[PDB]
Amino acid sequence: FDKITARISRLCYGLDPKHIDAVKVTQRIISTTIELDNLAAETCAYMTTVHPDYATLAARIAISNLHKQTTKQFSKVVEDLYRYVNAATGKPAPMISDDVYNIVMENKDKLNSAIVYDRDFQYSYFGFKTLERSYLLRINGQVAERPQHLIMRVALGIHGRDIEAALETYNLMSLKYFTHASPTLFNAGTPKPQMSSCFLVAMKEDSIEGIYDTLKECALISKTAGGIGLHIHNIRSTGSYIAGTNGTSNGLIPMIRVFNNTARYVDQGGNKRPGAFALYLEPWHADIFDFIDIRKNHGKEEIRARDLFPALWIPDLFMKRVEENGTWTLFSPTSAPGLSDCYGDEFEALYTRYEKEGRGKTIKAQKLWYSILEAQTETGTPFVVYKDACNRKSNQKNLGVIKSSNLCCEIVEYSAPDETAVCNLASVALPAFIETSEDGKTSTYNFKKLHEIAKVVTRNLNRVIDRNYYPVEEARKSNMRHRPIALGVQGLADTFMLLRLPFDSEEARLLNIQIFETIYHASMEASCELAQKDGPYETFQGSPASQGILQFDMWDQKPYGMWDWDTLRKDIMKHGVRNSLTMAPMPTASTSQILGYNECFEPVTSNMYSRRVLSGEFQVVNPYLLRDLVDLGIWDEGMKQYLITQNGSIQGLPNVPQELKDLYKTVWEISQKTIINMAADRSVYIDQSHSLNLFLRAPTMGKLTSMHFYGWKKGLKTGMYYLRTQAASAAIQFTIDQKIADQATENVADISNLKRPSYMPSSASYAASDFVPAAV
């Protein structure tokens, strides 16, 4: 029997007994001690619709539930995980590394009493559950680790015997200022710590040995988390000589199906595995037409492969030819060699000479276009990365010719048969640097704090290089030579909302520029400090950075100037930098979900959407918007139905102030010419590239075309990650009572009741957080 309503009503503070009503919660449990608490948090989540303070309630339950059924003290949890004898095989299967177990035990007091277990309450219910499902180490399908333990372990995984640097990293991470990529969270501090995310693999040689070494290498990388970009330009097309000849070659497709099959094989079950390769190919390759279609559902199933992602490595020349209405030539790399191995002008000269001497097959440039746009429309792929932009604007340009990007399209690093480029990723939580004035009515953005934290994260990523467990020797060889690194961001969208800036506003335009300028400056500064401690990276001498050319110099752009570039440039030219690259904003698909923020630099895709199961299927509304509507009095069952029929859009309510409407525009409602502008803006502070998705409502070849041509002309590197499309008719949905949903436009809003800080911009010379004291 029950009076658990007591256990539940205990956990509300900053509540409101009319908003919440712990009584109502118990009733909705219409059906051991732990089973009830799960449902208590489940149902209590369901009512996020009822009131936004139910989210907070459901988090508390799940969290202090986790506490009850879990060992409080860090060192003991570390013991258990280290001592784990495999339940069914009798033999020692430890989950902490020997090294980190020793550090923990040697420093148990200092460590144990640094943890603040309250900080477990910093998680969205859904964020918590994401951790719980895949990240918190489990003993016998029982969660062993609290969130705080996962963080300490990760901190020790990165810093080793540097307890000071670990305590710091523990603090910043537990306060959600930043986070490391999924592989780091999984594997830091474990027997073979593979913590890197991306690997760019070169197809070793156009031969069975070549192909099968690459395959083995890919299998090894993929099985230890971490995803692949694989360029395959050098492999002969359909119908090409083979010694032992009668056989003409079967081309790429058969090969691709071998890779596809391995991708599926290695993904064995209980996921941790980005079982996902992207393949990179230049559009002159004679098998391009088939390659491009790899992901389509209809058509011939022999010629298809769905665990793989096609990605275009595009020369300017191709865009030039489709832009006039020119010809385009397809070649087998055996007949037209070295094309993948030069760029810009050197490429146009070589390519063109091959054209003139009648090699390869002439076709209409716009015919390939067309096929490309067609695949993108149905499949979201192939990706577009501009090969000349990458190679002209890379700090690594002295290593040779960069032939690919990675699985998402953010990292751009040299790679060759014997050098597999690797990269470590973390993202900064942008909302974390908002500061509110005392009085609650003016807000500010702390670029100094941000600069600081980015230096911390630069130092972490740099240490992972040394502590990482490389799955293949080509990876280690490369990473020790060039020491690249990838910082990215998350929660851009939440911070525009929090600051009441419309995504496409002038204020947001400028904040975007400022955030990115400061992170680039921070990481370069930290990296110069590390060169002064451990020497430059092996390959620094002769790089563009060594001649004092920073990224924005390659784009012929004067920096915004919030930070002193003249000093840094001089320092770098004299001391060097530890890392060859530092910036590559990634999709933060899983990490942003954990931290409870929007994807990355993307606008919110929808103000209403579903979250995963557990006794039903969950409808949920944008938290900032929800509180705004509740504060405007407007929030109805009815407002909720209206929202469900407009699929989260707010743009139809005459009801609601324009400001609100501008603030809550959706990626579908925002000009793509704006998204690309902002991308082009931050790009000048990006070493590498960023994972730019594009979104279209009623897609037409035409807006799709001008989208590509626009990015390309602004000199972007990643023209397009995925293409995300939405029929105009999807934009509207059924609801169970359409006329209740209509009455919602008749609700009358306050305004004298909705207040929200107002943002004080900073400039290249005026801070702002400097001049406005913050709260506590």
Side-chain angles (χ1 to χ4, degrees):
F1 203 57
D2 99 283
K3 260 280 78 62
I4 63 157
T5 308
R7 293 152 19 160
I8 283 93
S9 60
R10 222 166 212 253
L11 297 156
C12 354
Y13 35 86
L15 52 28
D16 181 296
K18 219 283 161 200
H19 286 165
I20 206 277
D21 210 20
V23 196
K24 273 292 162 183
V25 179
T26 328
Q27 286 179 103
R28 208 150 299 167
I29 324 171
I30 18 162
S31 308
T32 37
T33 320
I34 217 279
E35 305 306 311
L36 330 178
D37 297 310
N38 278 38
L39 299 163
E42 267 168 39
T43 46
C44 198
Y46 277 9
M47 312 163 192
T48 307
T49 278
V50 180
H51 192 81
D53 273 10
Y54 274 94
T56 321
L57 218 296
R60 322 259 221 220
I61 299 166
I63 298 303
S64 95
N65 225 262
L66 169 278
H67 281 4
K68 290 204 164 89
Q69 58 159 357
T70 220
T71 300
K72 177 150 101 137
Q73 165 171 107
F74 179 65
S75 64
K76 323 180 101 161
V77 175
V78 183
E79 186 72 28
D80 297 3
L81 300 166
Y82 188 62
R83 290 309 160 202
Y84 184 75
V85 180
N86 197 49
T89 56
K91 304 201 214 313
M95 295 169 304
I96 305 293
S97 70
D98 286 331
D99 176 43
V100 167
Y101 174 75
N102 288 315
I103 297 158
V104 170
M105 298 318 270
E106 286 157 31
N107 302 94
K108 82 151 97 293
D109 283 33
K110 203 213 279 282
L111 259 21
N112 280 166
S113 59
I115 316 264
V116 180
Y117 291 96
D118 265 356
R119 302 194 182 166
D120 275 358
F121 292 100
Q122 299 232 182
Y123 300 97
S124 146
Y125 172 91
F126 309 92
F128 176 68
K129 291 278 141 194
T130 295
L131 272 175
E132 178 166 301
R133 154 159 2 95
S134 316
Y135 289 83
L136 270 37
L137 294 168
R138 24 196 58 210
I139 281 314
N140 292 119
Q142 205 97 39
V143 143
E145 292 190 312
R146 305 179 167 190
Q148 301 315 290
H149 302 157
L150 168 308
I151 294 164
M152 200 60 263
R153 146 164 74 85
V154 168
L156 268 3
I158 296 156
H159 293 106
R161 278 195 192 75
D162 193 343
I163 307 300
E164 202 184 318
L167 256 20
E168 171 204 56
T169 277
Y170 161 91
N171 276 295
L172 307 172
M173 280 174 73
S174 67
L175 290 178
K176 331 222 315 262
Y177 278 91
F178 68 84
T179 182
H180 286 273
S182 283
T184 305
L185 308 183
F186 289 141
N187 301 151
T190 73
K192 268 164 259 215
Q194 207 299 96
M195 299 173 290
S196 300
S197 278
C198 318
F199 290 77
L200 338 198
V201 178
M203 177 55 66
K204 280 173 196 298
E205 195 187 72
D206 178 26
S207 76
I208 298 298
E209 178 147 43
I211 287 157
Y212 280 76
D213 263 319
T214 311
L215 189 69
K216 172 177 141 130
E217 197 194 343
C218 291
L220 283 172
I221 290 162
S222 190
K223 111 133 291 138
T224 57
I228 291 98
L230 164 51
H231 54 275
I232 59 171
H233 322 301
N234 50 338
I235 280 158
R236 68 193 74 170
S237 50
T238 294
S240 294
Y241 191 70
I242 325 169
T245 333
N246 282 145
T248 210
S249 172
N250 282 135
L252 281 181
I253 289 301
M255 192 199 75
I256 285 150
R257 289 233 298 345
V258 169
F259 278 84
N260 192 63
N261 164 74
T262 272
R264 297 172 84 265
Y265 179 64
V266 69
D267 194 342
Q268 85 314 334
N271 248 304
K272 288 215 181 186
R273 200 86 38 147
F277 302 14
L279 304 185
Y280 280 79
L281 222 213
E282 299 202 26
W284 47 256
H285 193 272
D287 290 333
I288 186 56
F289 274 101
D290 280 349
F291 171 78
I292 224 68
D293 273 354
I294 273 321
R295 273 185 88 71
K296 282 178 159 191
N297 282 330
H298 60 89
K300 338 78 191 155
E301 319 300 60
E302 266 76 19
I303 224 144
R304 238 120 265 203
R306 285 86 167 204
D307 222 340
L308 260 29
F309 295 96
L312 292 174
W313 193 242
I314 294 170
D316 291 345
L317 223 222
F318 172 71
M319 301 292 293
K320 216 82 55 40
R321 300 290 181 77
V322 339
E323 184 186 27
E324 318 156 340
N325 180 8
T327 55
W328 180 246
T329 306
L330 309 185
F331 300 100
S332 185
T334 51
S335 311
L339 248 31
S340 46
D341 198 33
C342 51
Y343 73 95
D345 279 344
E346 205 200 333
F347 169 88
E348 13 246 71
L350 180 62
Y351 185 86
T352 234
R353 173 198 128 204
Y354 284 155
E355 272 187 317
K356 284 171 224 146
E357 68 205 29
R359 319 213 203 178
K361 176 170 169 265
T362 311
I363 102 275
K364 226 60 229 303
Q366 297 181 351
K367 188 196 187 188
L368 217 207
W369 198 230
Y370 189 74
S371 300
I372 292 161
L373 313 176
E374 209 183 302
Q376 294 178 347
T377 279
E378 10 211 296
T379 79
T381 67
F383 308 150
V384 181
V385 181
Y386 291 114
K387 112 151 190 255
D388 297 327
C390 292
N391 282 284
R392 280 186 277 89
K393 294 185 278 182
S394 188
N395 193 50
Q396 287 188 358
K397 66 195 294 180
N398 46 301
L399 301 182
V401 178
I402 300 164
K403 292 163 177 68
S404 90
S405 172
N406 63 310
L407 177 56
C408 320
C409 308
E410 88 271 32
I411 119 287
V412 20
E413 287 170 14
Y414 174 85
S415 63
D418 66 301
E419 265 174 34
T420 292
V422 187
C423 207
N424 311 120
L425 317 202
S427 52
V428 186
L430 299 168
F433 306 89
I434 301 308
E435 262 154 37
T436 325
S437 80
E438 196 32 302
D439 72 24
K441 62 209 192 284
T442 145
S443 75
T444 213
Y445 199 77
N446 200 347
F447 298 91
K448 291 200 163 95
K449 247 286 189 219
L450 168 58
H451 193 89
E452 190 41 64
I453 306 299
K455 302 228 282 165
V456 171
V457 176
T458 298
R459 293 192 265 255
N460 291 14
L461 291 179
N462 184 68
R463 264 192 186 163
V464 167
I465 296 174
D466 284 318
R467 288 182 69 78
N468 193 50
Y469 193 85
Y470 298 82
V472 302
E473 86 205 40
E474 304 89 314
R476 159 179 294 277
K477 170 167 186 232
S478 149
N479 228 24
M480 305 306 292
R481 288 185 80 243
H482 318 296
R483 302 193 124 262
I485 235 157
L487 289 130
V489 312
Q490 66 172 257
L492 219 215
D494 314 58
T495 107
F496 288 166
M497 284 173 184
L498 256 8
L499 266 25
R500 321 298 294 190
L501 312 185
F503 199 99
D504 54 8
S505 65
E506 182 59 52
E507 305 80 62
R509 194 209 54 122
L510 181 255
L511 184 62
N512 188 61
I513 286 185
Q514 287 173 340
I515 285 187
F516 284 92
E517 188 198 34
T518 125
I519 297 177
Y520 181 42
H521 192 271
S523 61
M524 285 312 256
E525 199 184 75
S527 192
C528 185
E529 291 175 350
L530 292 156
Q532 277 172 255
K533 127 126 105 289
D534 312 302
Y537 60 95
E538 177 62 26
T539 253
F540 176 80
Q541 304 80 226
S543 75
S546 82
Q547 304 316 98
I549 303 170
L550 307 172
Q551 183 56 182
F552 52 76
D553 296 320
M554 279 157 153
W555 292 72
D556 286 272
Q557 247 272 343
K558 290 171 68 286
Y560 177 64
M562 174 162 209
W563 300 92
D564 176 0
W565 293 99
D566 305 73
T567 285
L568 200 46
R569 181 182 289 95
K570 268 142 156 149
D571 278 342
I572 290 163
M573 285 184 83
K574 192 207 275 301
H575 294 111
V577 283
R578 197 67 184 126
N579 311 101
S580 55
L581 305 159
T582 61
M583 304 285 293
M586 56 283 148
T588 76
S590 332
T591 52
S592 53
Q593 215 175 315
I594 289 165
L595 292 195
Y597 296 135
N598 193 255
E599 260 55 34
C600 46
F601 39 101
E602 277 165 9
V604 40
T605 98
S606 201
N607 293 300
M608 224 195 52
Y609 40 80
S610 283
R611 286 277 164 77
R612 139 272 14 253
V613 292
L614 289 174
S615 184
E617 155 72 336
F618 203 21
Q619 274 285 240
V620 139
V621 40
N622 172 342
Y624 315 109
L625 165 73
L626 176 54
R627 281 173 309 238
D628 281 9
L629 298 183
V630 175
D631 282 351
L632 288 161
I634 283 182
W635 214 76
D636 263 307
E637 160 87 4
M639 196 25 121
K640 146 120 164 297
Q641 286 203 218
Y642 175 90
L643 262 196
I644 173 282
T645 73
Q646 298 308 295
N647 201 150
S649 167
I650 229 64
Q651 302 298 296
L653 306 162
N655 218 179
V656 154
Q658 251 315 76
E659 293 190 317
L660 253 259
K661 278 146 93 159
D662 299 317
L663 192 66
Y664 295 120
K665 281 211 219 71
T666 251
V667 82
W668 312 110
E669 302 164 338
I670 288 166
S671 161
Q672 294 308 278
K673 141 270 290 156
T674 276
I675 297 286
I676 294 155
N677 283 335
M678 300 180 75
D681 285 343
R682 68 172 74 102
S683 292
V684 301
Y685 312 115
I686 297 174
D687 268 329
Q688 305 200 54
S689 169
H690 54 123
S691 293
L692 224 220
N693 292 139
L694 266 12
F695 307 73
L696 281 180
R697 234 213 274 281
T700 63
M701 282 56 156
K703 47 225 266 251
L704 206 243
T705 297
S706 56
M707 257 183 29
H708 289 319
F709 265 90
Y710 193 67
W712 175 60
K713 280 170 191 283
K714 312 216 82 182
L716 292 193
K717 295 192 203 180
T718 285
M720 187 184 80
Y721 185 19
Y722 285 101
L723 205 212
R724 331 221 93 117
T725 57
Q726 179 197 65
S729 64
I732 296 149
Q733 247 123 47
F734 307 135
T735 188
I736 51 89
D737 191 319
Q738 247 291 161
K739 276 175 263 81
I740 285 171
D742 272 10
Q743 283 170 16
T745 54
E746 273 191 298
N747 287 189
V748 264
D750 220 313
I751 276 160
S752 78
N753 213 296
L754 175 86
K755 260 315 258 51
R756 257 30 161 188
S758 158
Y759 171 72
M760 277 208 61
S762 313
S763 68
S765 318
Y766 169 71
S769 304
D770 277 2
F771 303 97
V772 178
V776 173

